[PDB]
Ligand binder design. Sequence first.
Ligand SMILES: Nc1ncnc2c1ncn2[C@@H]1O[C@H](COP(=O)(O)OP(=O)(O)O)[C@@H](O)[C@H]1O
Ligand SMILES: Nc1ncnc2c1ncn2[C@@H]1O[C@H](COP(=O)(O)OP(=O)(O)O)[C@@H](O)[C@H]1O
Ligand SMILES: O=c1[nH]cc([C@@H]2O[C@H](CO)[C@@H](O)[C@H]2O)c(=O)[nH]1
Ligand SMILES: O=c1[nH]cc([C@@H]2O[C@H](CO)[C@@H](O)[C@H]2O)c(=O)[nH]1
Ligand code: NA
Ligand code: NA
Lengths: 356, 347
Amino acid sequence: MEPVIIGALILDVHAKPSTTPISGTTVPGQVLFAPGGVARNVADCIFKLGITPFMIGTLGLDGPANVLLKEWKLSMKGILRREDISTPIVSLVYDTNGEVAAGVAGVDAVENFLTPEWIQRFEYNISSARLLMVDANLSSLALEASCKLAAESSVPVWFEPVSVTKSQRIASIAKYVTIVSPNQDELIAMANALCAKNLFHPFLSIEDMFRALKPAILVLLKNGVKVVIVTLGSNGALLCSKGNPKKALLRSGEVFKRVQSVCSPNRFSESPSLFAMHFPTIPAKVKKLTGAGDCLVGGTVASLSDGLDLIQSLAVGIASAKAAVESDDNVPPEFKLDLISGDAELVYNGAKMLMV
Amino acid sequence: MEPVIIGALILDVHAKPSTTPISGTTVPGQVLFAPGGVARNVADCIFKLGITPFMIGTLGLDGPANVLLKEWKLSMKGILRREDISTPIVSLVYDTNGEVAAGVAGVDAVENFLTPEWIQRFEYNISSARLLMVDANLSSLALEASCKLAAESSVPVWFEPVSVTKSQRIASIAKYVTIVSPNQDELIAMANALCAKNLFHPFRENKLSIEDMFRALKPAILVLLKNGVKVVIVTLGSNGALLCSKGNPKKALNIDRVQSVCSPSLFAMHFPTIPAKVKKLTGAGDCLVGGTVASLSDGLDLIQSLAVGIASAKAAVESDDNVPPEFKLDLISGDAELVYNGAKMLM
Ligand SMILES: Nc1ncnc2c1ncn2[C@@H]1O[C@H](COP(=O)(O)OP(=O)(O)O)[C@@H](O)[C@H]1O
Ligand SMILES: Nc1ncnc2c1ncn2[C@@H]1O[C@H](COP(=O)(O)OP(=O)(O)O)[C@@H](O)[C@H]1O
Ligand SMILES: O=c1[nH]cc([C@@H]2O[C@H](CO)[C@@H](O)[C@H]2O)c(=O)[nH]1
Ligand SMILES: O=c1[nH]cc([C@@H]2O[C@H](CO)[C@@H](O)[C@H]2O)c(=O)[nH]1
Ligand code: NA
Ligand code: NA
């Protein structure tokens, strides 16, 4: 009853310039390949926490595909591969402080070839899934078909917004989506999509940052999303939900055990239209920020798959995202459950109710 | 006794966004890979014209190498590959109107790993080569090591200046070098590099008659020749190329179709190019070199060879890649005749 992950496998090109990138010209720097794609990163993170996901995606029969699959240890039954498909490539240029200065995504293969017809071959996997995660590299039609199959079996759906542009694909499926995980910029675009208007604009205290984002969050909840997680980079994450967050969504494995013992379900005092809490992250030595949000998703889905409640699960997601930033890859080579559970407790014990 | 090409194999990444790139996020667009590296491009043109070159270079045992080598169908014997080497990549992000908005080049592996020590492994190939082509991605020590092995066997050396910056590496090897192929800016940098003072100023504004551009550049050209360079080919983009030499330019290689159609002490000649609908300009110069080296390799004189080089570069600009998928030798010999019959003596 594995979680099912649907979306892009992408070959990332990461260009870290040694000096400030200058318009019109090339500067020296470090340029590397890394396995990427939001759905792939999530699946990867889940796997490394000891849960086996089922990946549905598409790849070429080309060089970049060979790179992505070199260390692939998951099933490939769900991956559509054909000679006429061009493996997706993302090109990132960072600034000197590790933020994306410019990024271009060539993900045509996912929009054109990762179709409802392809996804429906795996109707069984989806209906029996503990949870379905779809990323926004999917076409609207692929998203709709996916979410409906999930709903028909009341399988909870996680929508990953991917980027400011693609996040607006929440629009055609919001009533089917259980959880979304945007950053501040994607949240705004998603709210504008669901209002069918450019009402909200992009951009300090945690409290003011929440008050700032609250209307946007409400637009998402009013349109049927049950849980909104807003990731705030080095400031952690907001958890907002329709009603009690624990009550918004085989026997447990080891991830459950350690975390269940130290992140007690009886930690928080005591339903409400808007529930909001802030989760801190942990001091980290940053090597590469890219993909941390994806590991937050994977860590959260892993914990949920293993039976943890949502609040305990997000604490693990944040621990996982910390491990990810402290690595030079999108997803760490490995996870130390020692540090993961320890950090999760740190995050969990530091969490604060917002509307008090 | 194949020509030996030593230099960079680089993976070019071209990212063309559908909307204005926004910081903090990715926008949809097209991202393309293309085989690059000046010396690799040169070998590529040589091979596609039917001459088999020998490549000496360096790559990682990594992902970009895997992609880069997907269509490589030459020997790998001369290529140093190690797990600790990061394959060179140049990554460009364009704006919506097709000009470069941001670029990063990580091509240090060539200088750090393509060492004299590696190059000396192929002393046999270099000494028996009909021609040695080195690009300026090589470290100075690597350039010196390469050029000395050639000179000692009187193998002619072609130096590709690569860029305004790297063109300055000519300074310690100029006496070993037979031919250089700078564009207008690289020529200026090379002359300032060899000169006692930075006398020459770069081009800034209105374009000049070709005979007036030669007089402008002639002192710089003289600096190179006086420092031991035998032949200076200055490429002039849409205006073709200048060929200047010590003594008569009708020089062949000491070795033993176009010849069918192109009938055979400071000399200067202008070679016109051919009207072309440009698709991507980048790397055309590398095919001028490869086309010329191919022709020289097949026994043509320099004047016939440069005409082919210009034909080859015209085909290059009319393609989306650095080097065309193939060469239609029908069309090349045809363009070559045009260029050759169009060549003009200045001095
Ligand atoms: N500098 C950091 N130190 C510690 N944790 C971080 C840092 N940056 C990001 N994280 C963790 O990664 C998560 C995702 O970060 P964010 O940048 O908001 O998402 P995205 O990767 O989608 O842009 C954050 O919620 C936080 O939990
Ligand atoms: N518009 C064009 N049409 C035909 N040939 C061209 C055109 N532009 C450039 N070339 C060929 O490319 C060669 C090198 O171009 P140039 O811009 O001078 O060097 P680089 O490519 O090194 O910058 C020229 O000598 C010319 O033969
Ligand atoms: O349009 C897209 N942009 C960026 C990504 C992925 O985001 C990853 C980091 O979160 C990154 O690996 C990139 O491939 C994508 O899948 N689609
Ligand atoms: O430092 C360098 N930058 C770019 C190139 C190559 O020049 C090619 C075009 O002439 C292009 O393929 C690029 O890779 C190089 O060889 N050294
Ligand atoms: Na990282
Ligand atoms: Na071209």
